Design an enzyme around this catalytic site. Structure first.
Site: not given
Ligand SMILES: CC(=O)N[C@H]1[C@H]([C@H](O)[C@H](O)CO)OC(C(=O)O)=C[C@@H]1O
Ligand SMILES: CC(=O)N[C@H]1[C@H]([C@H](O)[C@H](O)CO)OC(C(=O)O)=C[C@@H]1O
Ligand SMILES: CC(=O)N[C@H]1[C@H]([C@H](O)[C@H](O)CO)OC(C(=O)O)=C[C@@H]1O
Ligand SMILES: CC(=O)N[C@H]1[C@H]([C@H](O)[C@H](O)CO)OC(C(=O)O)=C[C@@H]1O
Lengths: 387, 387, 387, 387
Positions: B69, B196, B211, B288, B322
């Protein structure tokens, strides 16, 4: 501003090569989309080559069963004429496994049909965004031209079919302005079949030479007027131009009905020349191989078989296939008439060749007031590939 | 000039496909960035697909641990909708492992967050150059939308979070003009969690469906007014739309508080329709996989579970993930209302599949005033790759 | 508006490097068209590099017999000077196995010759579309410059040959405006031979230094006036500039007739400088290796062999080959005169090297009022390739 | 119109990331030029990344001895900031193994030096075509900035050196308008050495912080006035900023002379801030690893070592290297001052790593009025490659 396209088609004596992409040969090493159904349409600034992709690349495992004709990966895209349908110079158009495109002088309008066979949806785009929709009206593979649609004074037209590939089907004419549908008509054609129409503009009306996949070896024709009134029938010429087809000597022409007991077909085209007609066809009468265009005297209005010109573009030892029409915008040619042009699709791979894939290449030819010598601008790719 | 975007969202009956990039299938042979978090935003001339790269390419060794991530290689870039996130047609945007983008009618504004987790920096770009900065205010993974921000009459807005992914976190609203921050607000949301956000403009205000990764299986909602005053809560509908989630029959709606004892989540979206609401969600309640959008009667203002429409875009045998919002600019659609559109990300690879990599593809759908038939425009890539 | 190009050629003291594409070296890993006959022509906004492709890519099996010179796959395309003739940055021009191109100040005009040897067709394009045609008038490999044509005040000119490569052939001058042929002339040249003319504009007339493939080791010259009246002959200089050729000490100059008993040749060039002349040539007198340009005092009007300047651009241990002229548009150089420039083609592969293929690279040099030191900007590719 | 660039440099508190190309990581599978000496320069519409190529691609055999620094294949090209120096998005600039570029507000001016070491030629381009030349004046590797030159009100300036890399050499200042040289000056600097100057515009004058490869571990500085009068010396700061260098505690500053017995060096930079100074340097004092920029109180006018700010951009466990300056055009930033920015080159391969090749990547940072947290946006490529 809008493209008038009210002029009449130019009276040509032969056709000269415009371009050749070499899509497949290049795709041997390069990153070229696996395609099928390529076609040409022009804006008052450039001509583009549209195509349906399988969402996969040549010489890759995803190019496997790329013969099925439809799938959720099938996409409509475009490049400038002569460029291979390569990934890095491609423009996305619409999600489609059947399409048609045309420019009205201001922006591009595309129509991509996708979705399930029994309930397909044709999404209409304009200026790069969807604007209107046409849902399957007969629940059986809604489809369209696979060739350039036609725009006359702002309003663009095209033909669509929905129904079986054999027996009677349903055909309609659509008309739109700036991406928004503004009219439509049902084409009464009992006993006849219509598909993959190759249209062009002539004297203010839209003329098309289509494909009868039910019983016709001669091609249907339909002159669409701006008010959506119309005239449907068959290319009068006493010579058949579809594939498969029987011998010319076994064929009596007919301006009103299909002839020959051939129930298949291939997308082809024809250009009216006064009362004459330029008609294209595969040299072979059974296979999609070789391409030639014949000019028949009074072949547009009479069961004539008086041939005045013959020019070969792909000899009979090479694969051909689809072919469609379009015209050169006066803003590009400078002429006072609409220069008639066409493209020939050269399919490689299955079903005719031993490869796990199927794609095609294309060559483009245009009007011209000179007799052009015969030759073969064939695909040229060497099969099989790293398969 | 600036995009007014003061119109109200168009009342749609279903959504039609806009595009499909086939990023991964193509990446089997082509040079495609390994991505994640793709999203769409439009200018009054074109719509683009933004994405976060791992600074590596599909079918390459650098695509290894591309599941983490975040990393210093993570970059924000873009291509025109429908194009794969390929290297040769890509535009650089910002150094980011979390982003958001939007056009005000004159230029593009992007926001890329990068840097250490405990002191990340969000750099704001405008017209292709950085203009302002937002430093982590709570020292814990500063993050943002991963979806299109919103511009109304020159001023663009977006939402940001900073804090743990479980318990209480901190959320703020930001507002800017020409790349320069001109205001901000703290969102009071005790007991609630926000992340998000998928926002769009409606009736002059900014509406978002976000979310809750702490305890909510139903999604939070926040209407932001130009003065940064606001209304926060949850999608009223008596139907949960996050993943993971419990059964609909076990879910009582709530306009003010989170419900269900699920502490994870996935980026999703929702469009207000008068008092109704179009809500998207993965078909599976735990994984998902699959995607569908439901229109609930009075679901935006009532704990209603009266379903009036249901359309599947990715069946449940295929991977989804997503999904976010954005609107079609009136300068592109010609409409008098703001056409609501969304995109669905289709993640392939780890954690669900046996591959050393993780990336995603996307499909785009738009408003439309017709009922669109169900279908599955899934990724379609064949795993594993030359791994 | 139109490019006047009525100024006189600038008097240069030496030539400086403009660009180097490294087409072949790059093609070792990249997707580069296999080419031959590359040349430069400029618009008042940019200069482009035109080339003939074999419709195949370097390091691919389709690059096999790419030595034949003609085929139905042969295509004319272009990129901006310095860029390799790569697939993703290429623009399609015309179907051709022999070409010429030039910009009149408004649009590009190209001329691609394709078709059977005994009945080839030269299609003329303008603004991206074919506008007129020239059919083979002597039924024997209709061919043209393989170098930039010339446009003076809207009207563009070029030279064409049709006939045997040995004995007497037929040569003509063509003149056109906006893609439409407006005049032509037959060049009376009995005992002489003309091919692949490298022309440029000077004092309102078109000057060319061509190739005699019949018996001349010295090059023919022809000054074309706007009315198509003309003066034909040979570069007066008492020094031979074709390949193969005999020693300079064995060569008596001649302004009116060919000299030396060499019946082959290579495309070369020359720039008039008052009564002087800059003449290029391969260092080797037998092979196409090394390149140098010599400035001979009164070499344009006298059987002079008084050398005043000598500059090497490709040493004699490296492969060279074709070379042609063109001028920098005043709208780009700011000068009050026409900056004379040239390009050197560096052929690699067969017949000189042990590879299954044949392609070439190019280096570009321009006018300049300074003495430039000798050096070798050779191809540099390492053969054989993954062959 | 011309870019005034008469404003003063903005007083920044830290620098935020602008972009990161990931050139090498991507080059593992993609078609990326092998490069070195990358740098940034901006037009009033976009910023570009310039670079010197070896005319070869990463992961290809031609990337072999790509450590030599010069060759006839060496070429100057560019892409938009953040894009990898890839083949399909690259623009050709000049034939060079040493370069400098800058935009005056109307067009781009480049300077590529190529040719033999004892008689190199620097060709100047403008608007895409060569306009003037500078021949080696001291017969010993004529070289220039390898960084953005400077344009103030139409006239662009840059610095050049010619002579040995050890003992005394010769340095000159050049000034030009629209590609045509309009003035020049010799820099009197006995005992001192100047190379690879990183310049920017400040208060109407051109300020540069260069590299002394003879005996200086502290960097030379030169303020060039529009009339070519000038002030040369060394960064006053009591802290050394070149590599290799001795400890800060062993270094007494000096505004007029070089200090430390280190005879090598690396291209670095510095930005004046009133009387303060932002100075960059590799963390390691011996190797080209890690990068950091320090702001010294009165470090521009005093032998000060009072550090007020320190920010790491590439930690010391990662490779760094060259770094240079440039400014954001006011037409892009909207500011009333000139936003100071820089780039860090991250060299991979030989001499430090076991690979047959040598290339580099880059990260870009810009002014900003906030303190940016430390981090490492290192190359990240995994060596060796398919070597
Ligand atoms: C900045 C970051 O790393 N965002 C990550 C997000 C986050 O960990 C979660 O929303 C809890 O805060 O999760 C996911 C995910 O596929 O679930 C991918 C994103 O890249
Ligand atoms: C929508 C669709 O699948 N069209 C297909 C078309 C169709 O089956 C036929 O015209 C009968 O209706 O046939 C062919 C074909 O090569 O013959 C390919 C087309 O993709
Ligand atoms: C149209 C054509 O084939 N031209 C060819 C030309 C020609 O054969 C010769 O000039 C005699 O006419 O020769 C050569 C050559 O490398 O020498 C390559 C050209 O492609
Ligand atoms: C023109 C040229 O070869 N410049 C080279 C430069 C030069 O040798 C040094 O500055 C002493 O003059 O050194 C380096 C280097 O990585 O240290 C690479 C440059 O390409």
């Amino acid at each position: 501003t809008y493209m008038n396209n009210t002029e009449a088609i130019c009276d040509a004596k032969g056709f000269a090569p415009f371009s050749k992409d070499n899509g497949i040969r290049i795709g041997s090493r390069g990153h070229i989309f696996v395609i099928r159904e390529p076609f040409v349409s022009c804006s008052p600034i450039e001509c583009r080559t549209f195509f349906l992709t399988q969402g996969s690349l040549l010489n890759d495992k995803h190019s496997n069963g790329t013969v099925k004709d439809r799938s959720p990966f099938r996409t409509l895209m475009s490049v400038e004429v002569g460029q291979s349908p390569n990934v890095y110079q491609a423009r996305f158009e619409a999600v489609a496994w059947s399409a048609t495109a045309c420019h009205d002088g201001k922006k591009w309008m595309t129509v991509g049909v996708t979705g399930p066979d029994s309930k397909a949806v044709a999404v209409i785009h304009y200026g790069g965004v969807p604007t209107d929709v046409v849902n399957s009206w007969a629940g059986d593979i809604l489809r369209t031209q696979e060739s350039s649609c036609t725009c006359i004074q702002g309003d663009c037209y095209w033909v669509m079919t929905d129904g079986p590939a054999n027996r009677q089907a349903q055909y309609r004419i659509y008309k739109a302005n700036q991406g928004r549908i503004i009219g439509q008509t049902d084409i009464s054609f009992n006993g006849g079949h219509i598909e993959e129409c190759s249209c062009y503009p002539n004297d203010g009306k839209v003329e098309c030479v289509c494909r009868d996949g039910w019983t016709g070896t001669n091609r249907p024709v339909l002159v669409i007027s701006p008010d959506l009134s119309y005239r449907v029938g068959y290319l009068c010429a006493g010579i058949p131009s579809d594939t498969p087809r029987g011998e010319d000597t076994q064929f009596t022409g007919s301006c009103t009905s299909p002839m020959g007991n051939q129930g298949y077909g291939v997308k082809g085209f024809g250009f009216r020349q006064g009362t004459d007609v330029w008609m294209g066809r595969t040299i072979s009468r059974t296979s999609r191989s070789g391409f030639e265009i014949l000019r028949i005297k009074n072949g547009w209005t009479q069961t004539s078989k008086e041939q005045i010109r013959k020019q070969v573009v792909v000899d009979n030892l090479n694969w051909s296939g689809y072919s469609g029409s379009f015209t050169l915008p006066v803003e590009l040619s400078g002429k006072d008439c609409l220069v008639p042009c066409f493209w020939v699709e050269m399919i490689r791979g299955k079903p005719e060749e031993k490869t796990i894939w199927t794609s095609s290449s294309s060559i483009v030819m245009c009007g011209v007031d000179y007799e052009v010598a015969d030759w073969s601008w064939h695909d040229g790719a060497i099969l099989p590939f790293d398969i």
